[PDB]
């Protein structure tokens, strides 16, 4: 089943690559890179880590079925089109990074993978053990031992934030990215609600060029700013802002809580008008 699956995915990605004849994330770059990695996986599987649910084989069954669905979406598409293709480029960027994180060189390391933030690392290994991936519903219940989310719109917004590959399952890599972006751990979901649900400056699933474009609407309003997850340095934020002369710049800040970075930038007079809006929310 697994070798057939890998063969099918590699062929779908070859078709897309041939049908796709810009700056990161770019499908034209990501398609052949993902197919090469899949080939590396396939070789390595024919010679594994801890067995059972959430292990290497389970991860690949899920990942490859999602990669097929996403590859069908791209195929079906080749202004609205520009957006649909940018969102899919971000999704493929995330699928490629997740497979590179968990099977570098084709060789599974999900049972050894270590999260960036120590409290989150501990939470995953104590709660999930050697597993590298969980279905959303099981993840939501496990995370709920520590950081419960309100069912409904809130929990669904959380799902959309965490699930980088839009697969319905949370890998240890996605949880690594989420807990870096929304650190610190003791207040994880309060940080996320304040920054990603309630803050006008937060944009999800936008590329560097899409924020450059969006902020042109506010170029006569120095101080205007937006923040969104970097697509090339996953786990870090990218803040776009209109400088004093009207130019649109983007910076990746220091590895610290985004709230501290935004508080400092407000106090220094750089991040004043979130998405160009008049009211900056209080983050204290």
């Amino acid at each position: 089943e697994e070798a057939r699956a890998l063969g099918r995915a590699v062929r779908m990605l070859q078709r897309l690559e041939e049908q796709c004849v810009v700056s990161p994330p770019s499908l034209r770059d990501l398609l052949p890179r993902t197919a090469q990695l899949l080939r590396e996986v396939a070789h390595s599987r024919r010679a594994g880590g801890p067995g059972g649910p959430g292990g290497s084989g389970d991860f690949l069954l899920i990942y490859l079925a999602n990669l097929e669905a996403k590859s069908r979406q791209v195929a079906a598409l080749l202004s609205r089109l520009r957006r649909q293709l940018a969102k899919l480029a971000i999704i493929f960027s995330h699928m490629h990074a997740e497979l590179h994180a968990l099977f570098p060189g084709g060789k599974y390391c999900g049972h050894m993978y270590q999260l960036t933030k120590a409290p989150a690392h501990t939470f995953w290994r104590e709660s999930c053990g050697a597993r590298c991936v969980l279905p959303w519903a099981e993840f939501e219940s496990l995370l709920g031992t520590c950081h419960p989310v309100e069912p409904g719109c809130t929990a669904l917004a959380l799902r959309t934030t965490i699930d980088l590959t839009c697969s319905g399952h949370v890998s240890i890599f996605e949880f690594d990215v989420f807990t870096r972006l929304f650190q610190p751990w003791p207040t994880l979901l309060k940080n996320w609600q304040l920054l990603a649900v309630n803050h006008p400056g937060y944009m999800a699933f936008l590329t560097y060029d899409e924020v450059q474009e969006r902020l042109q609407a506010c170029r006569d309003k120095p101080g205007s700013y937006i923040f969104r997850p970097s697509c090339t340095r996953l786990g870090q934020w990218a803040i776009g802002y209109v400088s004093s002369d009207g130019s649109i710049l983007q910076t990746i800040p220091a590895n610290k809580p985004l709230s501290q970075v935004l508080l400092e930038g407000q106090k220094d007079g750089f991040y004043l008008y979130p998405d160009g809006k008049t009211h900056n929310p209080d983050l204290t």
Binding site: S23, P24, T232
Partner: peptide, 5 residues
């Protein structure tokens, strides 16, 4: 992409 200090 160009990210500045």
């Amino acid at each position: 992409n160009e990210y500045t200090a």
